[PDB]
Amino acid sequence: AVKKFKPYTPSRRFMTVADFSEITKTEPEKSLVKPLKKTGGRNNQGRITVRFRGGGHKRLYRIIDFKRWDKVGIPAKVAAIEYDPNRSARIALLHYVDGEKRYIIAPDGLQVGQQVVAGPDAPIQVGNALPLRFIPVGTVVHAVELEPKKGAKLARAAGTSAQIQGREGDYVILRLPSGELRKVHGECYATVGAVGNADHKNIVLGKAGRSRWLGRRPHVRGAAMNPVDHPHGGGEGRAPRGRPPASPWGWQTKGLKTRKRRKPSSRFIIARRKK
Amino acid sequence: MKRTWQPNRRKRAKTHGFRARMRTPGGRKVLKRRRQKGRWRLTPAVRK
RNA sequence: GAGCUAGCCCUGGCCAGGGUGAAGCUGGGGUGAGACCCAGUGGAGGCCCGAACCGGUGGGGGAUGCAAACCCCUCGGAUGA
RNA sequence: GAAUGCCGGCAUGAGUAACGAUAAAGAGGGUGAGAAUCCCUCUCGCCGUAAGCCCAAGGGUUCCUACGCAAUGGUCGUCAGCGUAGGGUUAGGCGGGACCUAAGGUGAAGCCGAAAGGCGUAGCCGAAGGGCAGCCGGUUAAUAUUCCGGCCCUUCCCGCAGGUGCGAUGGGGGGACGCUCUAGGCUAGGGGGACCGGAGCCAUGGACGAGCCCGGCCAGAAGCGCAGGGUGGGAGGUAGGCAAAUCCGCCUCCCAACAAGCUCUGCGUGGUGGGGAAGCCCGGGUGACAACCCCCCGAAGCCAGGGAGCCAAGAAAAGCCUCUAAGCACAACCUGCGGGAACCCGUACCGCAAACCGACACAGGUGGGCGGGUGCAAGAGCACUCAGGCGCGCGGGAGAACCCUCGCCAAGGAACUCUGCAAGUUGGCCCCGUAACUUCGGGAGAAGGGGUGCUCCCUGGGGUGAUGAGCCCCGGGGAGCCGCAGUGAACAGGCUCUGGCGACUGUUUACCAAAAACACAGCUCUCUGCGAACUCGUAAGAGGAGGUAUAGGGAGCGACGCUUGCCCGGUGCCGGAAGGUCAAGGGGAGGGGUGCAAGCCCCGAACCGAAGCCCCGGUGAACGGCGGCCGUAACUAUAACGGUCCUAAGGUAGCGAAAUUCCUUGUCGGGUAAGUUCCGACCUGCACGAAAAGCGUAACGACCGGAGCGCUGUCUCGGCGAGGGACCCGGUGAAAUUGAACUGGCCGUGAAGAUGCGGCCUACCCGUGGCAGGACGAAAAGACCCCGUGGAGCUUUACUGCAGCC
RNA sequence: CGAUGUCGGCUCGUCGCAUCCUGGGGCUGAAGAAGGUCCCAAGGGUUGGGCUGUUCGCCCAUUAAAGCGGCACGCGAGCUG
RNA sequence: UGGGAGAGGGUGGUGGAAUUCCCGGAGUAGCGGUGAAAUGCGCAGAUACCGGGAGGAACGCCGAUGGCGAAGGCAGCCACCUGGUCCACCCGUGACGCUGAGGCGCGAAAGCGUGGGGAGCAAACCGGAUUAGAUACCCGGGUAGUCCACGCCCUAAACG
RNA sequence: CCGAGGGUAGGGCCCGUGACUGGGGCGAAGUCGUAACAAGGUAGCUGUACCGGAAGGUGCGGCUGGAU
RNA sequence: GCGGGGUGGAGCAGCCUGGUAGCUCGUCGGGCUCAUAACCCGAAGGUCGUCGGUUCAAAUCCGGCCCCCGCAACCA
Lengths: 275, 48
Ligand SMILES: [K+]
Ligand SMILES: [Mg+2]
Ligand SMILES: [Mg+2]
Ligand SMILES: [Mg+2]
Ligand SMILES: [Mg+2]
Ligand SMILES: [Mg+2]
Ligand SMILES: [Mg+2]
Ligand SMILES: [Mg+2]
Ligand SMILES: [Mg+2]
Ligand SMILES: [Mg+2]
Ligand SMILES: [Mg+2]
Ligand SMILES: [Mg+2]
Ligand SMILES: [Mg+2]
Ligand SMILES: [Mg+2]
Ligand SMILES: [Mg+2]
Ligand SMILES: [Mg+2]
Ligand SMILES: [Mg+2]
Ligand SMILES: [Mg+2]
Ligand SMILES: [Mg+2]
Ligand SMILES: [Mg+2]
Ligand SMILES: [Mg+2]
Ligand SMILES: [Mg+2]
Ligand SMILES: [Mg+2]
Ligand SMILES: [Mg+2]
Ligand SMILES: [Mg+2]
Ligand SMILES: [Mg+2]
Ligand SMILES: [Mg+2]
Ligand SMILES: [Mg+2]
Ligand SMILES: [Mg+2]
Ligand SMILES: [Mg+2]
Ligand SMILES: [Mg+2]
Ligand SMILES: [Mg+2]
Ligand SMILES: [Mg+2]
Ligand SMILES: [Mg+2]
Ligand SMILES: [Mg+2]
Ligand SMILES: [Mg+2]
Ligand SMILES: [Mg+2]
Ligand SMILES: [Mg+2]
Ligand SMILES: [Mg+2]
Ligand SMILES: [Mg+2]
Ligand SMILES: [Mg+2]
Ligand SMILES: [Mg+2]
Ligand SMILES: [Mg+2]
Ligand SMILES: [Mg+2]
Ligand SMILES: [Mg+2]
Ligand SMILES: [Mg+2]
Ligand SMILES: [Mg+2]
Ligand SMILES: [Mg+2]
Ligand SMILES: [Mg+2]
Ligand SMILES: [Mg+2]
Ligand SMILES: [Mg+2]
Ligand SMILES: [Mg+2]
Ligand SMILES: [Mg+2]
Ligand SMILES: [Mg+2]
Ligand SMILES: [Mg+2]
Ligand SMILES: [Mg+2]
Ligand SMILES: [Mg+2]
Ligand SMILES: [Mg+2]
Ligand SMILES: [Mg+2]
Ligand SMILES: [Mg+2]
Ligand SMILES: [Mg+2]
Ligand SMILES: [Mg+2]
Ligand SMILES: [Mg+2]
Ligand SMILES: [Mg+2]
Ligand SMILES: [Mg+2]
Ligand SMILES: [Mg+2]
Ligand SMILES: [Mg+2]
Ligand SMILES: [Mg+2]
Ligand SMILES: [Mg+2]
Ligand SMILES: [Mg+2]
Ligand SMILES: [Mg+2]
Ligand SMILES: [Mg+2]
Ligand SMILES: [Mg+2]
Ligand SMILES: [Mg+2]
Ligand SMILES: [Mg+2]
Ligand SMILES: [Mg+2]
Ligand SMILES: [Mg+2]
Ligand SMILES: [Mg+2]
Ligand SMILES: [Mg+2]
Ligand SMILES: [Mg+2]
Ligand SMILES: [Mg+2]
Ligand SMILES: [Mg+2]
Ligand SMILES: [Mg+2]
Ligand SMILES: [Mg+2]
Ligand SMILES: [Mg+2]
Ligand SMILES: [Mg+2]
Ligand SMILES: [Mg+2]
Ligand SMILES: [Mg+2]
Ligand SMILES: [Mg+2]
Ligand SMILES: [Mg+2]
Ligand SMILES: [Mg+2]
Ligand SMILES: [Mg+2]
Ligand SMILES: [Mg+2]
Ligand SMILES: [Mg+2]
Ligand SMILES: [Mg+2]
Ligand SMILES: [Mg+2]
Ligand SMILES: [Mg+2]
Ligand SMILES: [Mg+2]
Ligand SMILES: [Mg+2]
Ligand SMILES: [Mg+2]
Ligand SMILES: [Mg+2]
Ligand SMILES: [Mg+2]
Ligand SMILES: [Mg+2]
Ligand SMILES: [Mg+2]
Ligand SMILES: [Mg+2]
Ligand SMILES: [Mg+2]
Ligand SMILES: [Mg+2]
Ligand SMILES: [Mg+2]
Ligand SMILES: [Mg+2]
Ligand SMILES: [Mg+2]
Ligand SMILES: [Mg+2]
Ligand SMILES: [Mg+2]
Ligand SMILES: [Mg+2]
Ligand SMILES: [Mg+2]
Ligand SMILES: [Mg+2]
Ligand SMILES: [Mg+2]
Ligand SMILES: [Mg+2]
Ligand SMILES: [Mg+2]
Ligand SMILES: [Mg+2]
Ligand SMILES: [Mg+2]
Ligand SMILES: [Mg+2]
Ligand SMILES: [Mg+2]
Ligand SMILES: [Mg+2]
Ligand SMILES: [Mg+2]
Ligand SMILES: [Mg+2]
Ligand SMILES: [Mg+2]
Ligand SMILES: [Mg+2]
Ligand SMILES: [Mg+2]
Ligand SMILES: [Mg+2]
Ligand SMILES: [Mg+2]
Ligand SMILES: [Mg+2]
Ligand SMILES: [Mg+2]
Ligand SMILES: [Mg+2]
Ligand SMILES: [Mg+2]
Ligand SMILES: [Mg+2]
Ligand SMILES: [Mg+2]
Ligand SMILES: [Mg+2]
Ligand SMILES: [Mg+2]
Ligand SMILES: [Mg+2]
Ligand SMILES: [Mg+2]
Ligand SMILES: [Mg+2]
Ligand SMILES: [Mg+2]
Ligand SMILES: [Mg+2]
Ligand SMILES: [Mg+2]
Ligand SMILES: [Mg+2]
Ligand SMILES: [Mg+2]
Ligand SMILES: [Mg+2]
Ligand SMILES: [Mg+2]
Ligand SMILES: [Mg+2]
Ligand SMILES: [Mg+2]
Ligand SMILES: [Mg+2]
Ligand SMILES: [Mg+2]
Ligand SMILES: [Mg+2]
Ligand SMILES: [Mg+2]
Ligand SMILES: [Mg+2]
Ligand SMILES: [Mg+2]
Ligand SMILES: [Mg+2]
Ligand SMILES: [Mg+2]
Ligand SMILES: [Mg+2]
Ligand SMILES: [Mg+2]
Ligand SMILES: [Mg+2]
Ligand SMILES: [Mg+2]
Ligand SMILES: [Mg+2]
Ligand SMILES: [Mg+2]
Ligand SMILES: [Mg+2]
Ligand SMILES: [Mg+2]
Ligand SMILES: [Mg+2]
Ligand SMILES: [Mg+2]
Ligand SMILES: [Mg+2]
Ligand SMILES: [Mg+2]
Ligand SMILES: [Mg+2]
Ligand SMILES: [Mg+2]
Ligand SMILES: [Mg+2]
Ligand SMILES: [Mg+2]
Ligand SMILES: [Mg+2]
Ligand SMILES: [Mg+2]
Ligand SMILES: [Mg+2]
Ligand SMILES: [Mg+2]
Ligand SMILES: [Mg+2]
Ligand SMILES: [Mg+2]
Ligand SMILES: [Mg+2]
Ligand SMILES: [Mg+2]
Ligand SMILES: [Mg+2]
Ligand SMILES: [Mg+2]
Ligand SMILES: [Mg+2]
Ligand SMILES: [Mg+2]
Ligand SMILES: [Mg+2]
Ligand SMILES: [Mg+2]
Ligand SMILES: [Mg+2]
Ligand SMILES: [Mg+2]
Ligand SMILES: [Mg+2]
Ligand SMILES: [Mg+2]
Ligand SMILES: [Mg+2]
Ligand SMILES: [Mg+2]
Ligand SMILES: [Mg+2]
Ligand SMILES: [Mg+2]
Ligand SMILES: [Mg+2]
Ligand SMILES: [Mg+2]
Ligand SMILES: [Mg+2]
Ligand SMILES: [Mg+2]
Ligand SMILES: [Mg+2]
Ligand SMILES: [Mg+2]
Ligand SMILES: [Mg+2]
Ligand SMILES: [Mg+2]
Ligand SMILES: [Mg+2]
Ligand SMILES: [Mg+2]
Ligand SMILES: [Mg+2]
Ligand SMILES: [Mg+2]
Ligand SMILES: [Mg+2]
Ligand SMILES: [Mg+2]
Ligand SMILES: [Mg+2]
Ligand SMILES: [Mg+2]
Ligand SMILES: [Mg+2]
Ligand SMILES: [Mg+2]
Ligand SMILES: [Mg+2]
Ligand SMILES: [Mg+2]
Ligand SMILES: [Mg+2]
Ligand SMILES: [Mg+2]
Ligand SMILES: [Mg+2]
Ligand SMILES: [Mg+2]
Ligand SMILES: [Mg+2]
Ligand SMILES: [Mg+2]
Ligand SMILES: [Mg+2]
Ligand SMILES: [Mg+2]
Ligand SMILES: [Mg+2]
Ligand SMILES: [Mg+2]
Ligand SMILES: [Mg+2]
Ligand SMILES: [Mg+2]
Ligand SMILES: [Mg+2]
Ligand SMILES: [Mg+2]
Ligand SMILES: [Mg+2]
Ligand SMILES: [Mg+2]
Ligand SMILES: [Mg+2]
Known about the structure:
part of a larger assembly; 2 chains; A: mainly beta; 15 strands; B: mainly alpha; 56% helix; binds potassium ion; binds magnesium ion; RNA-binding; ribosomal protein (chain B)
C-alpha cells in the first residue's frame, strides 16, 4: 500500500499514490456508467455557492447500488474490483446469477470470485446486506441506511465503519464513524464489514498540482484579503485576527455549534461525536 | 493589443437581436422606446 | 453590458528538437529465505536546455508616439496549477 | 468684453515638426497636357516556419473590364481597395439545413413568486464534437471537388428477381473516447542517379565531357497483392435488461484459438484519363511521339477502434446491427438489378492584412493547415536560397553641432555610480575533470581545461538491398597541409564565495510595484449524522453531492527538521432542567368611569411565565496577555542568593544592534590602503520569541544585500568612424500656446524676485543655425495642508435600524 | 495653493571675502628652520580614493593648499532619481 | 525410534473480578484527603446502595525458596503454528568437534515516526499544604507516555 | 617525444593563530543551599525522559551494592 | 506638553473623605542551641521631598520649587 517516490523532482519527495493492488479491472462497465456533470461549484443561478471548485479531471459516474434490498435472496458473484473516481472507496462489480450487474462499494477483505447475498437470512459474512436488526450485536458494518428503504447513508467512505452496540425495540444502536451514538431503525439495511481502502488517508497529495487534478481550486485566506472581502481582511502588514475568528460571512468559526437545536433527529442521537 | 470589439455574428444576434429583446420585459420596452423615437433600425443589423 | 477582462462549464486544437535517466522488468551476485548490491533494459517527472506559443525582468528608445502601453536589446515559463 | 462660457468663423506658432519601421535602389524604352511615383525591360536589394500558399472568423463588391483624376492616397499620379458604367459567385458528393446529441438554453407534467416573473422531468433547441456519398485534369478578363472531360459514388421513389417471421421511439449491442510512451508496414515530402527525355551551351586561361543547364509524373472502379483494424462457434437452462424477445446478461457442456474464417479500412497495382521543364519565339506557341525509370532518406500523417505503461480513471445521442410488441404475413423487410427522383442557403474578393479589431492605407492584435534546399550535432533555431512575394505612397542633395542605433580604441581596468546601471566577457558540440554541503535526487553546464578546418591512407559496425555493389547512418587509427584565427559567417551561459527573505513549479496590482506579497502540498483548531453544515435565492429550487466523518464547510499556519512554554480575571465559544433578572400571555388583591339597575367599559398588585443577560465551571494552533523596586559573594565589578509591592500570569526554549536597535556609524573581530553597508560575535532586546508560529534547513529565485575573479568607453578622458535624423532644395503641411506688445542690463522701488516704475548704463533695422538662465515659461481650477455643519470606501464594545439566527 | 518641482549627485559656472594656498607685511614668549597672531590682498589655484542616498562627517594616500559662504539650501522646459 | 515437563515464542479467539464514565432508581449533608489540614468534589442532589450500559488495561487464588528461555524476558483460558529441551532404548552416521576477530540477528524501560486507542496510572504542568525557602518529599488535579500495528532507537546495577 | 621547473585551476592532510564561546583541572580560611555516607532524616544506585538557581527532583523499568 | 509618584533603614498601606500614621522585612534587647540559622518573647526607629498658602488643625486640600518614573512629539 501507499507507493512512495524517490525525490527526483521537488514534489516527488512527499507525493504518495494509492497502490491499486486490489483492482482487477481497469475500465468500467458500459451499462453502469453515465456522465457526471461537473458543476464547478455553481448552482442553477450560475453563482458560485461552494468556493474554490473546478478544473478537475473528467469523470464518469458509476451507478452504485445503495439499496440491495430489492434483490433479496438472489446471490451474486464478485466479478471484479474497480477504481471509482467519484468516491474514496473502491467499488465491487457483482454478477448476479440473475444475470443482472450492479456496483457496490468494496468492503475490506472482499475477494473477487466469492459470492455475496442480501436479506434477513444472509450469512453474517463480509459483503452481505441485512436489515440492521438481524445483524449480531457487536459486528462492524458499513453502508448503513439511515431510514428504511431510503438508501445507504452512513459509513460509505474509505476505511469507515459503524459498529452495532445494542438495540432497543424497533431500533439498534450504532457507533457511527464519527463516534456519535445514534439509534437507527432495525429495518435499515447495512453491509457487514468495514469499507475497504483504509490506506486512503495516508495519501500525501504531494504538490499543488494534485489538488488541481481533484478539482480543488486554490483557497485564499481571509487574512490575505481586504475588509470588503472578509472579516479578517486588511491591516497594515500582517495582522492577527483581531476579533473572534470568523468566516467570510461573519459567523464565528471556532467552536460555534451550528446543528439546528430543535431538529427532530435529536430524539434519536444518544451521544454527540467524540474527539 | 487585443481590443474590446471582437465581432461575432452569432454573438451579436443572440445578445441584442430581435428575439432576445422580445423575450424579456426590459428588452420589449427597448423596442417600444426605439419605435416611439422613430429609430429606423430597432435592433443591430447582422448578416447571418 | 462577460464580443474587453475574471472564473467556471461543454466541445476541439497546440507544445520543433535536444538532455537527464525514477519505478518496474530481466539477468547476475547475495541469503536459510530475504533485505540489498551490480549490469542491462526501461522511459517516469508542476525534471533540465531551447523555438513555436504564453509571459513582461533589467536597460535604452518612444513621450502633439508607429502605438490612449508601442519598438529594440535582454530576460521568465515552455507535459503543465 | 471677460463666465478655463456656448456655436461658428479666422488667426498665431510656420513655410516650422512631420510625411508612420534604415529591406534600396539605378537606367532604358513606352503612355500622357503633365511622370522619381503608371506600364514594359534589364540591373540592384529584401522575405522565404514568410513578408510565400491554403482554410476559418470578421469585412461586404473591396473582385474583373472599360472610361476617369475633383476629393480620398501623408508627395506626385496618366495609377488605385477612389469616381462612373458594364460584367462576374453555377454543387445530390465541399460547408450548413431537410440527421444526432454536449454545456447551456427552452420547457406539455409539476412547483414557486405582490405584478413583471423564477424554477423544472420529459421533449425540443443548441456544434468547430458524432454521422454522412468526389477524386484528377481542362476552361473564364473574373467561378469551379460547383461548368466541361474521364473515371467513381450516395440516398429517395417505383418496378423485376431472389431470399426472410416481417414489423419500434421500445429491449440489447455498437457508436464510445484520457495521458505519456510506442511496434510493424505504408503514404506525403525530400536527396541522388555514370539511367531516360530536352531547346540549346563551350565563354575569359582550361573542359566536346560519365560536361553544364532542364525535367523524369498525377488520378483511377472491379480484381489481385502487401499491410493492419474488428470479430469466436454451437448447444441446454434462465427468475435479470420495468411488456415481449430466438436478442443481450448469467450458469453448464462440446469444438475452435499468439491462428484460421468472415468482415472493414489503408497502401500498392490496376482498364483508362490527364499532366509534361529549361530554353527559344510572339498568356500562348514550341520543346514533344517529351521522357516518365532505378537507389536512398522518410513522417507528428495513414492502417486505427494498433500496442505498452500510468492515475488524475478519461461526453452524449443518432446513423448502424440484433431482439421482438402491437399490427401484419395480397403485407413488410433483406439482397441484386433496372428506370426514375434528388430541394433550400453559402461559393465573388481581402483574410497576419491597405479590405478583419485598433478614429488613419496605424511598426500593435487575430484561430487551423502547407511551409522546399544546403550547412551549422539535432530543429519550425540560424545564415543563404527555391517556388512565390516584396523594396514598406515624398523625394533630391549636403557631410555642422546635437540625438538615436552601431563599430573600433593606446595605458589603465569599476578608479564610474545609489548599484558594474549599461556594455564587455563567457557562449554549440565532443572529451578530460569537477568542492563545501545534501533531504542522497542533487549541488552540476559547479569550477577548470583540451579538442573543433582541410588532404591522403588503413579500418570497425549499423540500415536498406540479398548474405554482395550502390546509396545512407554512427564511428576508430595513421600521416599530412594552410591561416592571426577551423561551432573561421550567423544563432548559442560570465563565474565564484557569502548573508536576508520565501521550501519548492506556480500566481499577482491589463497600463509606474512580480516582490519577501498570493497560492501551494503539509500541520492544527473548529463546525457538520445527511432533508448535513455552509452558500445563492422572497420562495420553489439549486450548489454541497447523486458525496456521507479516510466526507464536506470555515479559520490560522505554510515542504521538511527540532520544537511550540506560563496566564481562563476581562471578551469569544462551549457546558450547566439550581438561583436571579426577564416580553407578550396567564392571573385578578383591588380600585375607576358611566347607568335606576341588571350591565356595559377602563385601570390594576402579589403570583405563574422563553430565549437572552446575570451567576457556576471549561476552553489558547480561541480574542489576547506574559512585572516593579531594594539589597547581597574575602580586590573591584557583577549578582547564583534574599527582602518587599503587584499580577489572571509575570516571556520558557531558541534567537538577538535583527527586513525588528531609538541612543547608533553601539562595541569587538573579519574583509579593505581606507568599510555609516557586509559577515562573525557580544547582549542594558527604546520596541525578538514560539502555528498574525520560534529556530534551522539541501534545492530552487529575472527577489534584496556584501565580496572576489574574469572582462570591459562605466570611468580617468575622451577620440574617430557608420547609418537614420537634424541642415539645404522641390512637394505636402500640423500642434499645444496666445490680453495686446513698439518684449534690453544694473541698482533701486513696487503686493516683499520688474522688458513695462525711477535713476543710470547699454542698444542701427531683419533674420538663420544652435543653448536653455528668465519670461514667478506650457500642461493639469494643488494630489500635500487647511476650510465645507461637502462626498465616498472602510472599522468598531459610536447611534439607530434591518437581514439572518434564537 | 485656475501649481513658484521638493534632498543629494552630475554638468556648467559666476560672485562675495570673515583668506585654505600662493604674494606683501607688523608683533612674537621670532636664534635659524619651522610656527603663532594680526594687517593687506579675491589674480590664480584649491587632488584621487573607502563608507553612507546623503549634504556633513569619519578614514586612506597625497598636497602649496585640500577655504567658507551667496546665487529660488545656483542650476530637473540641462541630466540623474 | 518411543515418550515427557514447561509463564519458550507468534497469530486469532475469549472469560471473570476491579476502576472510571454514562443512564435509571433510591436516598440526604456531606464526601474526600492528611501528621494535621487545605485545595478539590457536593442541595445545580455528591458520597454510600441496587439495576443497566460503555470502554481500556491488567490477570487474584493456584503461586512456590517453583517452571521455561541464549540473554532481554515470559503468568486468566482456549485453539492453531513454532523453538528449545530432558529421559528411555543402545538401532543408524563414524570425529562430522570446541571456540570464534569480522558479519548477521535478538535485545528491559524510556525515547522517536505514522496510524489507532486511552479506563487506571502519571514525567511535564497547575493547585493545596509543609517550610526560611520547597522549582521537592505529602494532598487535589493533569499532558505526553503507559496499550495496539508497522517501522526506528540498541542503552542498562542488560548482575551470578 | 620526454624533460627540471614555472604558470593557471581545483582538491586532500597537518600545523599555527582568531573577536567570542564551551566546559575542565587546580587554587588556607567567599556566597547559596544540604544531594550522598546512619532508614543521612523521601532506602540508594541505575538507563532513559522531562523539569528546576544549584546540588538534584519526578515518571517508567531495572539492581541490592537496601536498613529493620 | 499630558498622567502618576516622593512617608521609620528596605518595599508598601493611610491622601480621595483634614484631627487617629499602619503592614511585611530589617535593626536592638532577651530566650532555645554545644554554637549559628530557623523559631519564640519584648522594644526602638517616621516631625510624611521643600517652601508658601487654606484652616482651630495639613502626610492628607490648593499653589510653586526640587526630584523620580511613564506617555506623547503627528501632516510635510
Ligand atoms: K502653493
Ligand atoms: Mg514519496
Ligand atoms: Mg531517496
Ligand atoms: Mg486498491
Ligand atoms: Mg450507454
Ligand atoms: Mg453534480
Ligand atoms: Mg436550467
Ligand atoms: Mg460563477
Ligand atoms: Mg462556499
Ligand atoms: Mg468554486
Ligand atoms: Mg468522497
Ligand atoms: Mg476508489
Ligand atoms: Mg431511523
Ligand atoms: Mg495528508
Ligand atoms: Mg478529479
Ligand atoms: Mg490559503
Ligand atoms: Mg490582507
Ligand atoms: Mg492586501
Ligand atoms: Mg465586491
Ligand atoms: Mg463592510
Ligand atoms: Mg467586515
Ligand atoms: Mg483584521
Ligand atoms: Mg493585511
Ligand atoms: Mg496588508
Ligand atoms: Mg505590524
Ligand atoms: Mg488584536
Ligand atoms: Mg468576528
Ligand atoms: Mg448560521
Ligand atoms: Mg455527533
Ligand atoms: Mg489586451
Ligand atoms: Mg472574441
Ligand atoms: Mg459567428
Ligand atoms: Mg460561429
Ligand atoms: Mg457567439
Ligand atoms: Mg441570452
Ligand atoms: Mg436575438
Ligand atoms: Mg415570457
Ligand atoms: Mg412586462
Ligand atoms: Mg408587457
Ligand atoms: Mg425606415
Ligand atoms: Mg436594440
Ligand atoms: Mg469572447
Ligand atoms: Mg511544450
Ligand atoms: Mg548529453
Ligand atoms: Mg515494464
Ligand atoms: Mg518591456
Ligand atoms: Mg542590460
Ligand atoms: Mg505613454
Ligand atoms: Mg515590442
Ligand atoms: Mg529580442
Ligand atoms: Mg526553458
Ligand atoms: Mg464685465
Ligand atoms: Mg462656463
Ligand atoms: Mg465654445
Ligand atoms: Mg466651439
Ligand atoms: Mg469652432
Ligand atoms: Mg458656418
Ligand atoms: Mg478656418
Ligand atoms: Mg504658415
Ligand atoms: Mg520654431
Ligand atoms: Mg511633430
Ligand atoms: Mg515617424
Ligand atoms: Mg529610378
Ligand atoms: Mg509620376
Ligand atoms: Mg505627373
Ligand atoms: Mg511597372
Ligand atoms: Mg527555408
Ligand atoms: Mg471596414
Ligand atoms: Mg485625385
Ligand atoms: Mg471628374
Ligand atoms: Mg489626398
Ligand atoms: Mg497617410
Ligand atoms: Mg492621360
Ligand atoms: Mg467577378
Ligand atoms: Mg456534381
Ligand atoms: Mg424534405
Ligand atoms: Mg439554441
Ligand atoms: Mg456538425
Ligand atoms: Mg467525443
Ligand atoms: Mg457532407
Ligand atoms: Mg472517389
Ligand atoms: Mg483543377
Ligand atoms: Mg468570357
Ligand atoms: Mg424481425
Ligand atoms: Mg429499433
Ligand atoms: Mg465504450
Ligand atoms: Mg465511456
Ligand atoms: Mg533530403
Ligand atoms: Mg493509383
Ligand atoms: Mg427469460
Ligand atoms: Mg506537338
Ligand atoms: Mg501533430
Ligand atoms: Mg487515427
Ligand atoms: Mg498519469
Ligand atoms: Mg443525453
Ligand atoms: Mg394479405
Ligand atoms: Mg434477412
Ligand atoms: Mg424543403
Ligand atoms: Mg468559388
Ligand atoms: Mg503577427
Ligand atoms: Mg491588403
Ligand atoms: Mg503605407
Ligand atoms: Mg498594420
Ligand atoms: Mg527541393
Ligand atoms: Mg545546430
Ligand atoms: Mg523603401
Ligand atoms: Mg511591410
Ligand atoms: Mg534626404
Ligand atoms: Mg548640410
Ligand atoms: Mg536599425
Ligand atoms: Mg566588431
Ligand atoms: Mg578593425
Ligand atoms: Mg581601451
Ligand atoms: Mg579588474
Ligand atoms: Mg585585469
Ligand atoms: Mg564597486
Ligand atoms: Mg563620472
Ligand atoms: Mg561579448
Ligand atoms: Mg556566440
Ligand atoms: Mg569548496
Ligand atoms: Mg564533489
Ligand atoms: Mg558553494
Ligand atoms: Mg548550506
Ligand atoms: Mg549527494
Ligand atoms: Mg544543461
Ligand atoms: Mg584533434
Ligand atoms: Mg580550408
Ligand atoms: Mg601558417
Ligand atoms: Mg544558456
Ligand atoms: Mg517563491
Ligand atoms: Mg513570495
Ligand atoms: Mg521561512
Ligand atoms: Mg522551509
Ligand atoms: Mg514551470
Ligand atoms: Mg502594474
Ligand atoms: Mg495600477
Ligand atoms: Mg491602467
Ligand atoms: Mg510589489
Ligand atoms: Mg518573477
Ligand atoms: Mg499577490
Ligand atoms: Mg511555499
Ligand atoms: Mg507542516
Ligand atoms: Mg442569501
Ligand atoms: Mg446532486
Ligand atoms: Mg512552504
Ligand atoms: Mg536538517
Ligand atoms: Mg520548554
Ligand atoms: Mg484568559
Ligand atoms: Mg474566559
Ligand atoms: Mg473562566
Ligand atoms: Mg404574543
Ligand atoms: Mg430563561
Ligand atoms: Mg487582555
Ligand atoms: Mg543585539
Ligand atoms: Mg552591526
Ligand atoms: Mg536576527
Ligand atoms: Mg526592518
Ligand atoms: Mg524591535
Ligand atoms: Mg542602529
Ligand atoms: Mg563604525
Ligand atoms: Mg579589520
Ligand atoms: Mg549592550
Ligand atoms: Mg495571532
Ligand atoms: Mg508580526
Ligand atoms: Mg533557506
Ligand atoms: Mg522565485
Ligand atoms: Mg525572483
Ligand atoms: Mg563585486
Ligand atoms: Mg573585483
Ligand atoms: Mg562613451
Ligand atoms: Mg552619420
Ligand atoms: Mg512647398
Ligand atoms: Mg496634400
Ligand atoms: Mg497693446
Ligand atoms: Mg504694440
Ligand atoms: Mg524685441
Ligand atoms: Mg533686446
Ligand atoms: Mg521687502
Ligand atoms: Mg527688482
Ligand atoms: Mg527695459
Ligand atoms: Mg521705466
Ligand atoms: Mg510713476
Ligand atoms: Mg528708466
Ligand atoms: Mg548696462
Ligand atoms: Mg530655416
Ligand atoms: Mg533655431
Ligand atoms: Mg530658457
Ligand atoms: Mg531649463
Ligand atoms: Mg524659467
Ligand atoms: Mg504666475
Ligand atoms: Mg519658470
Ligand atoms: Mg522654468
Ligand atoms: Mg498633467
Ligand atoms: Mg472646477
Ligand atoms: Mg483649487
Ligand atoms: Mg486638480
Ligand atoms: Mg495649510
Ligand atoms: Mg459638525
Ligand atoms: Mg459651518
Ligand atoms: Mg460631512
Ligand atoms: Mg471614492
Ligand atoms: Mg492657469
Ligand atoms: Mg499651470
Ligand atoms: Mg607670504
Ligand atoms: Mg584669490
Ligand atoms: Mg542641504
Ligand atoms: Mg552624516
Ligand atoms: Mg607650506
Ligand atoms: Mg555654497
Ligand atoms: Mg527654491
Ligand atoms: Mg537649509
Ligand atoms: Mg534656507
Ligand atoms: Mg536648490
Ligand atoms: Mg526631470
Ligand atoms: Mg534635482
Ligand atoms: Mg522648467
Ligand atoms: Mg451545596
Ligand atoms: Mg433545591
Ligand atoms: Mg472509551
Ligand atoms: Mg548402536
Ligand atoms: Mg530495545
Ligand atoms: Mg499554593
Ligand atoms: Mg538480577
Ligand atoms: Mg623555469
Ligand atoms: Mg543529606
Ligand atoms: Mg532530607
Ligand atoms: Mg518535580
Ligand atoms: Mg501593603
Ligand atoms: Mg486612596
Ligand atoms: Mg483622611
Ligand atoms: Mg509601625
Ligand atoms: Mg496630621
Ligand atoms: Mg495622518
